[PDB]
């Protein structure tokens, strides 16, 4: 996006379970907030 042109940086995920943005634990693609993998990369 505006930050990192055409480069998907994984500091922006969204877990819909927390309804709050997260920075996941990639190895599993878990959410740091609840460890449910209902995170999509933004």
């Amino acid at each position: 996006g505006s930050m990192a042109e055409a480069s998907p940086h994984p500091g922006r995920y969204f877990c819909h379970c927390c309804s709050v943005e997260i920075v996941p634990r990639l190895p599993d693609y878990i959410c740091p907030r609840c460890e449910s993998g209902f995170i999509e990369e933004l």
Binding site: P10, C17, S36
Partner: protein, 100 residues
């Protein structure tokens, strides 16, 4: 098929056992091909998950899987996807007459 008899096997690597969770309580399978739909697939699972393909968002490996591509692009044979519900895209989709 019934009475096809033209190479009884064909899928082999194809034919996914599409596992898909909804929020936490559930986890349901949507067995299809590897590259069969995803598009029409989402349309099909819409009721089973109570999520219509238009709002419906398949997330696996944090990837936003949608009707735009094929299943094998996401390689979800035998893995549970994560379904979610977003905020209404009314600002994204003006004129809510056609399918609105």
């Amino acid at each position: 098929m019934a009475h096809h008899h033209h190479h009884h096997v064909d899928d082999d690597d194809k034919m996914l056992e599409v596992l898909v969770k909804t929020l936490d309580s559930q986890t349901r399978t949507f067995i299809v091909g590897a590259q069969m739909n995803v598009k029409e697939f989402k349309e099909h699972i819409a009721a089973s998950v109570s999520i219509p393909s238009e709002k419906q968002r398949l997330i696996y490996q944090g990837r936003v899987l949608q009707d735009d591509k094929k299943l094998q692009e996401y390689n979800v044979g035998g893995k549970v996807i994560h379904l979610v519900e977003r905020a209404p895209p009314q600002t994204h989709l003006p004129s809510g007459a056609s399918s609105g």
